[PDB]
Structures are given as C-alpha cells and as structure tokens.
Amino acid sequence: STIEEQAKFFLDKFNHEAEDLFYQSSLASWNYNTNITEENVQNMNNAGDKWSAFLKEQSTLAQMYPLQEIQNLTVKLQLQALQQNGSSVLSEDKSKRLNTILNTMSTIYSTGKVCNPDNPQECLLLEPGLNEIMANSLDYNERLWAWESWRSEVGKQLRPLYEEYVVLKNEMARANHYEDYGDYWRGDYEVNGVDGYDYSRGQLIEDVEHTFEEIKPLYEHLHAYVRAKLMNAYPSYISPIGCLPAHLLGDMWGQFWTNLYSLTVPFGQKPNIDVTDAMVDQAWDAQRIFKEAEKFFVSVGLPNMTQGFWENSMLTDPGNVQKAVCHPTAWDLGKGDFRILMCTKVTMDDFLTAHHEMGHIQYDMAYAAQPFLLRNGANEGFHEAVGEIMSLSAATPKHLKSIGLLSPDFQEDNETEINFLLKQALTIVGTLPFTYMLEKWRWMVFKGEIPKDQWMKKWWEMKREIVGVVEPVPHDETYCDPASLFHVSNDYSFIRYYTRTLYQFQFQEALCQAAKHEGPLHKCDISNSTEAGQKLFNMLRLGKSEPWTLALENVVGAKNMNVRPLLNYFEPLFTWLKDQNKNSFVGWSTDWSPYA
Amino acid sequence: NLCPFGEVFNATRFASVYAWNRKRISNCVADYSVLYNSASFSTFKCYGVSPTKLNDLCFTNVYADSFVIRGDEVRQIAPGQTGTIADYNYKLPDDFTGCVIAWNSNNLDSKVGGNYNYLYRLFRKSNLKPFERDISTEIYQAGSTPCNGVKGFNCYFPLQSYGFQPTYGVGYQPYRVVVLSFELLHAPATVCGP
Ligand SMILES: *[C@@H]1O[C@H](CO)[C@@H](O)[C@H](O)[C@H]1NC(C)=O
Ligand SMILES: [Zn+2]
C-alpha cells in the first residue's frame, strides 16, 4: 500500500476512537457545567485527561506519515491538523515552568483584590466590583481609583511573570518551527499548497493594517463626537484636541465603548426599541424564544433542531437544586448530539443571543458530515461571525414585526436609527482600534521589536497614536497594563475579534443582496430567503475541509478580508457624525496628558 | 403452527453486525400481517417480492438475518451499496429477493455510560461476497511491513465498538435490522401464508 492509503487507514482508526473519547470528555464537561458537584469535577478532569493523552500519542503517530507524500487535500489537512495538535516538543522542566506561570497569572487575575484608600478592610474584586465602577460610575475620582489601582496592585504582580512568559512561549513556538509566539498565533490563517487561495502568516499583518487604514476616518469622527459629549460629562477634565483618558471609556480598559451610550446618545428623548415588554405580555417563555429562533433558520432553508436538542439542552436555570455555569454556549458533543447551555430569561437580549447561539449549532450541524478533524470553523473568526449575523437580522424592526413583538403600524424615525447605529458603533467600531493596537503590541513584543525596558513606554505611545486614548497617570516599566486584561494574562489570541468583525459584515452584505434587500444594509432581515440560506450553507458545510479564503469566496465572492461592508453598514452614521463634528476638531494630539 | 417470527424480532439481544445471526425458517405458517402493519419500523423495503402479497405464496426456505447497526448505516443494507458495513460486515446480493426491516432500538441497546456490546469490522483485505461472514480477529496489516500479530503502527485490531448512548443523534443511535430472504425451489415448500 502507498503512504496515502496507509494514512487513510490511520485516520479511519483515529476518527472512531477520537469520536468516542471526545464524546466522553464532552459529556463529562457538560454534566459539570450543568451541575457543579465535586464528583462532576473529577469525572470532567479524568475524561479530559484521557482525551489529552490520546491526542498526544496520536499526534506523534500522525507525524509518521510525511505530509509531502500525501496528495489528497482532505487527507493532508487532517494529518496536518493532528501533527500540530497535541505536540509538546518543549522540555519537561520548561513545560512545567510555563504551566506554573500560566496558572499563577490566571489566579492573580481572578483573585486580585483592590482595597479602598479610606478602609483597608473594604476590598473589591474585578469580577463584581471594579467592573461595576468602570461600567456605571460617573465620578471622575472613583473611576480613576479603580483604573489605577487594578494596574498598581494586580498589574505590577503580572509584570515579572509576563516577562518569563514571553520567552518561554517563544521557545515553544520555535519548537513547532514558528518564528515566535506571535507568528504561531497567526498560523491559524495560513494556507499552503492550494494555487490561487494561498495565504501566508505575514500577509495577515499587512491585511489587518490595510483594512484598518480605511477604518480610521470613521473612527476619528466617532472619537471626536464622543470627546465633545464627554467634555460635558467631565468638564475641565478633557481637552478638545487631546486623547480620551483611559478610565472614562465604559470599562476597565476601553475594550468597548458601549456603556458610554447614556452620555453620547444622539437623541435622548427617543428611547431605543425594546420588545422585552412585548414578550412578557404575550406570555413568552424560554422554549418560545428558542422555538422562534428555530423558525428563523427554517425560514431560510436550514434544518430544524434535532429532537435530542430539545431533550438534552438546558434552556433555563436549573434552580437551587443544581448549580450551573450560566453562560450561553453552544455544545457540539459529536455523534449527532447538539445542545445549547443557557439560563434564558424573557428579555430582548436573551432572545437575540438565542439566535446567536443557534447560529453556532447550525454551523456545527452543517459540517457534521465532515471527518472529525475538519469539524471546525474555516478559521478562528468564522464561527462567531456566523452567530453575530443571526443577531443582526433578528434585531431589525422588520423582523420583530414579523413575529408579533413590534406593532404592525410601528414607525421608524431616522432619529431612532441613528440612536441604534451609534450604540452599535460604540461596541463594534470602538473596539477595532483597541483590538488591533493590543495584538500589534503583543506581536512586536513576541518578536523582540519592543524590549522589556520599553514595554509600557511603547504601550502608551500606541494607545495615544492608534486608539486616541491617554493614561491618566504615568506608568513606568514596573507596570504591565496589557496583562490587566483577561485575554493577555490568560494566554488567548485577540486578533480574531478584529477579523470576525470584518467577516460578519461581509457575510451579512452578501446574504442581503441574495435576499434582494433594497434599503440601507443595517435594516436588512434575511428571513424567508431560501437563496440567502443556501449561500451561507454552501460555506457552513465545508468546515475546515477547504482553505478559509475559499470558504469566504463561497459567500462574498472574494478571497480576502475586506472592510468596505463594515463601512457601508455605518454609512448613515458616518454622514451624521461628520455633520455633528463641523464645529469640533477631528483627530487628536498625542502630546496632551491629564497629568501634564 | 405459527412461524417463529417473535423469536427474531422480539429477541432480547441482537448480534453484532460482524457476527450477524442467521435463522432458517421452515415448517410453519407465516403471518406477515402483523409485520408490514406494525407502525414501528422506520425501514420496510422489499426487493423482488411484494409486501401485503407475501401472505399468498408458499416458499421453500426463508432465511432471517438480524444484527444491529447505527442509523446512518441502514441505507447500506440494500443491493449494490458501499460502505464499512456493506463492504466488511454484511453484504446484500445485487439481485436480492427479500425485505429489509429496521427499527430504532435506542431504548433497548443504549446505556448512559456507553454500550460496548455491539461491534463492527473496520478493516478487511477484500470486500465480502454476498451473505459471507467474517468473525476472525486477526491483526490487519495496513502497510507493506508485516505485523506478525503485533498491534501497533499500521497494524490495527479490526473490530470496533459503537458505544451506543441514549443521547446520541438518530444517525448514531442503534437500529435493529432484520433481513428476510425468500427462495422457491422444487423442494418440500413449508413456509406458506394463511
Ligand atoms: C413483540 O411482542 C409484543 C408484545 O410485547 C407484540 O405486541 C408484538 O406484536 C411482537 N412483535 C412481533 C414481530 O411479533
Ligand atoms: Zn458565539
């Protein structure tokens, strides 16, 4: 037999045992997240350990079939996905040292306490306390205390660990033949061997910076509008030509500007629409919400939820009888078992995340016929982009009338649309400079372009230059402000939040032309469009079996990430912001500081 | 006297598809009426012969083959089909005269921890001839290097288990299958209808 035939036999054996062991680890993980008992933790860890040990030995076996001798593309992708997954060429002592660092940083983040200057027994955690201040406080001093202390108590603890974390992760990346840990993260977008669809690891950096250049004009006018509104919220605290202080952005870091909506609302006399009151009046329960979300996907030609979905999912809080992790998640246990984990309430928000999370399930169901190792999103940004566009259509006033939650003769003023679009921009657009700047700093840190003696100096130089945000107090190199964010201190890639955001508006734009939508892009509902459901399904069914550039082409007709669909969604707001900023200065000086 | 159909369909345990069980049925009056109008079979496909007409003609020898497979594999129990089950476990002849009967047995053949009683053969040197049975457990040689009975790289154990659990999707749930083969020859014909 040839090497390719031998590898196909190896995957046939692997797929059977992997599906069994992955199901057992998923069922044990499900039982813990739906019922937190000590016995369920032990069953989850042991089943997870058995799965991790299995992947490690199968990865070493998969490396025994050389990639260069395989000709079938589907076999090559499965072997490559197994040779890289479960590989641990780091030394034993350095692997334990890295894991200890990772666990120490995670514990510092989740247990770090900040105590009041007045009372040292009154202590606040980030998880329920500092975040509440940063999201709801209108007091300049209270926000500055929470912002600066989190970085003074917790941030300074992570700095020595993050220094060793960088070099140890770079060693792990070189053991997998990547240039550094940043290069290793960018390997998710790599495509080799397919003529016309290839994509190099360095191409992601150039494509991210090229798209961001076209985002700058829209962000600059969003920045200028928010600044002028913030000068009235905090008079004598904000320069009309300077950056925004970091502690006044609506959360601990400025990741999203969503909580600034109450200070920057375009028309504060027109309330945003909310069908929460209509659901309670019509006696909606959690089952109705998910039955309605099921009707949405069926309306575009997608399949119904399986009978096991309704029997095995957890769509309400179990109660006091069982303690559960109340965090909306879509589960793909394998073997045709799909469930949603949600403590649903009868609110418009939970109604929308149901369409989001069912979107994941539709994605998982579509590529279930793929081989095991290809049952994943095209790249790391495809899945959440699919869930987000479900929420986009389900939230439109067209859709809410169709299901009886809005009145038939409800009228949409352009003022309420500008209100809606600005709330969207604060979340969607406001996070894009934050995300790009954060990963860029991490990329240059990993490859050594930013030495440790300039970590915080360069960090706040790019916060000023790229994001237009300035520190309220100066920070020397004893600080580690990046690590104060969960993703940086818990070792999670971040650029996916940038690429996914561009993907989702590429998808929605392409699906709305297939749905023959006429008006502005943000008013579009793909419901009852068989052609829109088929265009999306022709990608969902692929999984990882094709390069992500081909998967994107099946939907949008182009092979690359493009930012024009995003700019088209916010075009009604872009024109409005430009007129509001006629009297104001657009852009920012990097010289001004609240402490200077 | 009636035919032992209740012993085949209502059996406590079915066989594994790789060791599918065969029972020859003769010297009895068959009541196919209880069968084709049971409303509990998800698959009742007949080839050559006709349902609701089997209660008329006598047959020389009637064979009943039974086993358990998963739902997505029931399509392979048909003439001229291809797959792990049709190739290596149970092969129906291309010119098959008989009926394929299948029903969901999740309530009987699934345990929460996983039911490892039902196996299937994953590898074989060649495809199975029609109605052939392979119950050997010889190590399969996937490469050119000999195995010499050692399980390892390119040397696999040929039987795998379904691990049926009740929370599986319908395509992975256990399905009990009964294949009825009919033949008429110039021999004492003792399988008639009422
Ligand atoms: C199996 O037994 C049940 C009684 O429990 C009976 O109703 C059914 O008809 C039997 N099936 C066959 C094929 O004889
Ligand atoms: Zn999601």
For residues B182 and B51, the answer to whether their CB atoms sit within 8 Å is no
Helix residue spans in A482-542 (DSSP H):
486-489, 496-514, 530-540
- Sign of torsion over alpha carbons A345, A347, A349, A354: positive
For residues A188 and A537, the answer to whether their CB atoms sit within 8 Å is no
Atom of ligand 1 nearest to the CA of B10: 1
Nearest-CA residue for atom 14 of ligand 1: B6
Provide the greatest CA pair distance for chain B.
Answer: 60
Does the active-site annotation cover A487? yes
> Of the candidates A566, A574, A441, which has an alpha carbon nearest to the alpha carbon of residue A506?
A566
Q: Are residues B65 and B9 in the same domain?
A: yes
Q: Residue for token digits 């053949």? A: B109
Token pair, residue A568, equals 């088209």
**Centre of ligand 2 from the C-alpha of residue A387, in Å:** 6
Token pair, residue A74, equals 């589907």
The residues, any chain, with a CB within 8 Å of residue A450's CB and separated by 6 or more, are: A441, A444, A458
For residues A220 and A567, the answer to whether their CB atoms sit within 8 Å is no
Q: Are residues B50 and B25 in the same domain?
A: yes
**Centre of ligand 2 from the C-alpha of residue A293, in Å:** 15
Token pair, residue A294, equals 């099921």
Q: Are residues B22 and B78 in the same domain?
A: yes
SS3 B67: strand
**Centre of ligand 1 from the C-alpha of residue B38, in Å:** 9
CB atoms within 10 A of CB A357: 23
Query: What is the 3-state composition of chain A as percent helix, strand, coil, each rounded to the nearest 5?
Result: 60, 5, 35
For residues A423 and A267, the answer to whether their CB atoms sit within 8 Å is no
The residues, any chain, with a CB within 8 Å of residue B65's CB and separated by 6 or more, are: B20, B21, B22, B23, B90, B131, B178, B179, B181
Query: In terms of residue numbers, what domain contains B153?
Result: 114-165
For residues B31 and B194, the answer to whether their CB atoms sit within 8 Å is yes
Token pair, residue A144, equals 């500055």
Which of chain A's residues have a Cβ under 8 Å away from the Cβ of B153? 61, 64
Structural domains of chain B, count: 2
Q: Are residues B65 and B146 in the same domain?
A: no
- Amino acid identity at B121: R
Which of chain A's residues have a Cβ under 8 Å away from the Cβ of B168? 308, 335-337
For residues A518 and A528, the answer to whether their CB atoms sit within 8 Å is no
For residues A145 and A246, the answer to whether their CB atoms sit within 8 Å is no
Indicate which ligand has the atom closest to the C-alpha of A497. 2
Does the active-site annotation cover A357? yes
Query: What is the 3-state composition of chain B as percent helix, strand, coil, each rounded to the nearest 5?
Result: 15, 30, 55
A168 sits in which H/E element: helix A156-175
Please tell me if the CB atom of residue B41 comes closer than 6 angstroms to any atom of ligand 1: no
Structure determination technique employed: X-ray
**Centre of ligand 2 from the C-alpha of residue B120, in Å:** 37
Atom of ligand 1 nearest to the CA of B8: 13
Token pair, residue A94, equals 């350095």
- Sign of torsion over alpha carbons A166, A172, A175, A180: negative
For residue A365, the number of C-alpha atoms closer than 13 Å in the C-beta half-sphere is: 22
> What span, in angstroms and rounded, lies between the C-alpha atoms of A248 and B13?
69
A16 → closest Cβ in B114, B122, B171: B122
Indicate which ligand has the atom closest to the C-alpha of A357. 2
CB-defined contacts A:B, below 8 A: 52
DSSP string across B112-145: TT-B-S-EEE---SSPPPTT------PPEE-SSS
| Phi, psi for residue B191 in degrees, rounded to 5 | -125, 90
The residues, any chain, with a CB within 8 Å of residue A255's CB and separated by 6 or more, are: A431, A434, A435, A485
Q: Residue for token digits 């479900």? A: A390
Looking at CA atoms only, how far is residue B145 from chain A in angstroms?
A: 10
> What span, in angstroms and rounded, lies between the C-alpha atoms of A500 and A495?
9
Helix residue spans in A403-485 (DSSP H):
414-428, 431-446, 455-462
Residue burial A209-225, b: 16+ Cβ < 10 Å; e: rest: eebbeebeebbbbbbbb
Indicate which ligand has the atom closest to the C-alpha of B31. 1
> Of the candidates A448, A314, A409, A404, which has an alpha carbon nearest to the alpha carbon of residue A33?
A314
Q: Say whether A335 and B160 touch across the interface (CB within 8 A).
A: no
Could you tell which of B5, B9, B10, B31 is best to mutate to test the pocket of ligand 1, judged by most ligand atoms within 8 Å of the CB? Answer: B10
Among candidate residues A357, A384, A439, A509, the one labeled active-site is A357
DSSP string across A127-140: IIIIHHHHHH---H
Q: Which residue of B has its CA nearest to A312?
A: B167
Q: Are residues B127 and B158 in the same domain?
A: yes
Q: Say whether A306 and B170 touch across the interface (CB within 8 A).
A: yes
SS3 A368: coil
E strand map for chain B: 21-25, 28-29, 43-47, 61-70, 98-104, 119-121, 140-141, 155-156, 159-161, 174-183, 191-192
For residues A520 and A288, the answer to whether their CB atoms sit within 8 Å is no
**Centre of ligand 2 from the C-alpha of residue A361, in Å:** 10
- Amino acid identity at A274: D
Mutate which of B147, B157, B168 to test chain A, going by most A C-beta atoms within 10 A? B168
What is the crossing angle of helices A431-446 and A455-462, to 10°? 150
Which of chain A's residues have a Cβ under 8 Å away from the Cβ of B172? 335-337
For residues A230 and A259, the answer to whether their CB atoms sit within 8 Å is no
Residues of B with CB under 8 A from a CB of A: 114, 122-123, 142-144, 153-154, 156, 160, 163, 165, 167-172
What is the crossing angle of helices A548-556 and A530-540, to 10°? 170
A526 sits in which H/E element: none
Q: Are residues B79 and B120 in the same domain?
A: no
Resolution of this structure in Å: 2.7
Residues of A with CB under 8 A from a CB of B: 1, 5-6, 9-10, 12-13, 16-17, 20, 23-24, 27, 61, 64, 306-308, 312, 333, 335-338
- Amino acid identity at B134: D
A493 sits in which H/E element: none
> What span, in angstroms and rounded, lies between the C-alpha atoms of A243 and A236?
14
Residue burial B34-51, b: 16+ Cβ < 10 Å; e: rest: ebbeeeebebbbbeebee
Token pair, residue A351, equals 């109604």
The residues, any chain, with a CB within 8 Å of residue A473's CB and separated by 6 or more, are: A144, A148, A594, A595
Among candidate residues A487, A531, A553, A571, the one labeled active-site is A487
Please tell me if the CB atom of residue B4 comes closer than 6 angstroms to any atom of ligand 1: no
> What span, in angstroms and rounded, lies between the C-alpha atoms of B10 and B6?
5
| Phi, psi for residue B104 in degrees, rounded to 5 | -70, 130
Q: Are residues B154 and B82 in the same domain?
A: no
